[PDB]
Amino acid sequence: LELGLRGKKALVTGGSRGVGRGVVLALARAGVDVFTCYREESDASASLARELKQLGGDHHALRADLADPKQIAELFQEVGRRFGTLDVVVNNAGVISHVPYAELPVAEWQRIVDVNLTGAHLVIQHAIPLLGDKGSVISIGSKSSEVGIPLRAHYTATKHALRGLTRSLAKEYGRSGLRFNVLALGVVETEELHALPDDERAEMTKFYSTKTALGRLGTPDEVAGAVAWLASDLSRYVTGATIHVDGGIS
Template identity: 35%
Template sequence: MQLSGKIALVTGGTSGIGAAAVRRLASEGARVIVVGREGPRLRPSGVPIERTEPIAADVTDPDAIARLMSEVKTRHGRLDVLVINAGVATAPPIQELAPASYEALMGVNCKGAVFTFVHALPLLAEGASVIFVGSVAARKGQPGDALYAGSKGFLRAFARNAGTDPDLLQRRIRVNVVTPGPIDTPLSAAATADPQVRAYVERLIPMGRWGKAEEVAEAILFLGSPASSFTTGAEITVDGGMSHA
């Protein structure tokens, strides 16, 4: 197995892409720490209980992230794979943006992602892999997505630079981004319950269908495995061709 004996951590690992990543990494032998806000929901279905460890943490709180990483250090002493997936997509139209709605989205998507990365740095083992989960929204303008798209564009720029940081490269730490397009998850299903909306989205995708969380998880596995040993600062797009249409 590609990740036998490795320690992985996935934020937002309770459902959707995060849960699929937990299942895939565990299937390749990793012991996966599943991070989310709600303790009772922290074990995704389909993963052997002995392969996962749930830890509740609010990624919008840097102190909570620091405590999370301290717990990981106590339990394992290191991290080999870090998947920064926690994110939200709810934001009002641009004309109605207020500081509170800005903070609610950016606190998770940007501040949470950055400080998860920062507090994990001392734990990252030699040759570790960090994977940020972005969005095609950062590359494909859509009405109503300005703040969300901006947050994901920030992640892409952050990872591009972190992935070429000399101190990290000296430790052979890789930093990359997986960029999903429309993926069929419980969250996206709730947001596009109207069949006409789902059909509209499908028309934007050259492959003519929504993606599966498991398809994104395969890209995450590649970047988390030794197969990506010469890949850093890069982006793998899993969007059915949407960003090129």
């Protein structure tokens, strides 16, 4: 009963902020070699590279717009050279916006589809040759895609699509040693929430807290505990599953 992660190689999309950042740092502290990407150079990406260097291990953070297939194929050329193999993939990169559905432009629909759904598919497709004969693929889904949220049907559409992708991939590749699962998250504190001043903050927090069974929002490190279990052989009979990490929300 040991996670046994030290020495594994992971790819985590969207590691500069939020959930992806916490997963990257927690996997790295546990001795996983982490490859991550981000869309745009920023102080968050720069501080990310700084912590990865501060820690021991063979970590890499490259810019790659998942809306762009050329940049995804380039990311994986770098992954194939620096790592050569993979044990874990975490599809975490995603975008959201609130547009009244009737006003949602076709281009904003297309962007959210390109990043959240087509981006995840291309990442997985490029990762399959690197995963070899054994590997664990983890996609970050959303509890909200079962509940429904006004002004985000495009987001809930893409997040729910990940579950159907995952279920079929679990069937197609299970006998080859690849496992595919979804983590359905509740509401997780991120820097964008702590960048809000107290009023439009301690009002979101209690609005969502009452919705939960635990009475609090999640953190990126709690998500990482579940990623760690799915990365490990303690979950070797788990595939095609949607694991809720949501505090029992609604």
